[PDB]
């Protein structure tokens, strides 16, 4: 089960966050981890298209080379807090799994500046909650978490030490498709 007491950062700037560009997950903390261990890579691009907030997602497994995409229309619950009803698609936007009622994820932007951010996400699939996941994002895939994002991890009562880095993970990203899924 997830947490819904994640606090959106005060004075969160929507225009810079949803600029249509890519965010790399450089470090993450999964509270409910699988039995089998799988180290992932993930990136996302949040923007606007046709007048709606949109977020496209990318997950890459460096050990199997398996890759999946998702596109969702976002619904703002309160600035910095959003609900995403996702659909799994191919990189060209063809739908593999349609939008389903029990399928969504919500995320809170806990901290964000021009180059970094700390978010909380809760994945819900088939009316089954799947557990809290905290992620540190950066607009550059090689940058280490700075003092500001680290203070934000502390302020949410977490230990940055428990965070796992994707830096030495052999990650490969497909930004072109990420950005283009924004309109699908
Ligand atoms: C902001 C970052 C993330 C968001 C919003 C997010 C969202 C999601 C969504 C929507 C799915 C469902 C895919 C589908 O079936 O269509 C998913 C699945 C998955 N994600 Fe992520 N994810 C994020 C980061 C990560 C990271 C860094 C990891 C590593 C812990 C991860 C590991 C997985 C795995 C293993 C699955 C498959 C379902 C399971 O076994 O629980 N994701 N993610
Ligand atoms: O602008 P910062 O987050 O790199 O200090
Ligand atoms: N996840």
């Amino acid at each position: 089960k997830c947490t819904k007491n994640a606090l959106a950062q005060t004075g969160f700037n929507k225009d810079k966050y949803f600029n249509g560009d890519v965010w790399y997950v450089t470090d993450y903390l999964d509270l409910e981890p699988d039995d089998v261990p799988k180290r992932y890579c993930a990136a996302l691009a949040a923007g606007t298209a046709s007048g709606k907030l949109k977020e496209a997602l990318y997950h890459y497994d460096p050990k199997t080379q398996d890759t999946f995409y998702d596109v969702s229309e976002l619904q703002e619950e309160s600035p910095g807090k959003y609900t995403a009803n996702f659909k799994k698609v191919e990189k060209n936007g063809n739908v593999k799994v349609d939008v389903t009622s029990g399928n969504y994820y919500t995320f809170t932007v806990m901290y964000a500046d021009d180059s970094s951010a700390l978010i909380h996400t809760c994945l819900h699939k088939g009316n089954k909650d799947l557990g809290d996941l905290y992620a540190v994002l950066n607009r550059n895939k090689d940058t280490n978490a700075g003092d500001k994002v680290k203070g934000a991890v502390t302020a949410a009562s977490l230990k940055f030490s428990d965070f796992i880095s994707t830096k030495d993970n052999k990650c490969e990203y497909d930004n072109v498709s990420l950005k283009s899924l924004l309109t699908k």
Side-chain angles (χ1 to χ4, degrees):
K1 235 267 212 164
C2 302
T3 313
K4 347 235 149 227
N5 265 353
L7 284 260
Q9 81 159 342
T10 183
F12 156 68
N13 190 351
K14 239 209 269 14
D15 305 63
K16 285 188 170 147
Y17 194 82
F18 297 96
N19 66 349
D21 249 84
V22 178
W23 284 109
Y24 299 97
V25 168
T26 71
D27 307 83
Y28 66 96
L29 174 71
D30 195 324
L31 288 319
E32 251 192 72
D34 293 339
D35 292 337
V36 58
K38 21 201 62 248
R39 261 156 95 229
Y40 266 32
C41 304
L44 62 102
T48 73
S50 298
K52 4 210 123 126
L53 292 158
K54 307 278 305 273
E55 175 155 279
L57 251 180
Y58 169 86
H59 284 77
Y60 174 78
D61 180 359
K63 296 83 133 275
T64 64
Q65 259 232 34
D66 168 59
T67 322
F68 57 104
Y69 301 81
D70 291 276
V71 171
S72 346
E73 197 151 316
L74 298 170
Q75 156 186 338
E76 193 168 273
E77 309 286 19
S78 125
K81 285 217 170 243
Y82 305 87
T83 280
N85 275 113
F86 62 92
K87 79 177 171 228
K88 191 174 168 177
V89 297
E90 297 279 5
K91 74 197 211 144
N92 57 15
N94 285 341
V95 193
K96 288 163 76 57
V97 183
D98 303 50
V99 169
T100 323
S101 240
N103 288 10
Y104 61 89
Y105 67 87
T106 62
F107 70 94
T108 295
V109 188
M110 296 164 84
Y111 172 80
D113 54 34
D114 299 78
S115 69
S116 73
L118 165 73
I119 73 190
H120 164 262
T121 59
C122 170
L123 179 57
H124 196 71
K125 212 153 121 74
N127 307 109
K128 227 280 288 194
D129 234 13
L130 273 34
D132 289 327
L133 189 155
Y134 294 92
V136 178
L137 317 174
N138 204 291
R139 306 232 84 142
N140 185 273
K141 83 175 170 288
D142 280 308
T143 308
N144 300 323
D147 282 351
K148 283 180 210 24
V149 77
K150 270 142 82 133
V153 167
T154 299
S157 300
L158 310 169
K159 271 304 222 113
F160 195 68
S161 279
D162 295 343
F163 273 67
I164 291 165
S165 184
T166 68
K167 207 131 203 344
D168 281 311
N169 242 269
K170 290 195 178 135
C171 298
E172 224 89 62
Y173 307 84
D174 186 23
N175 292 151
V176 185
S177 299
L178 262 183
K179 281 189 259 260
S180 47
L181 287 175
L182 246 15
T183 68
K184 314 293 200 199

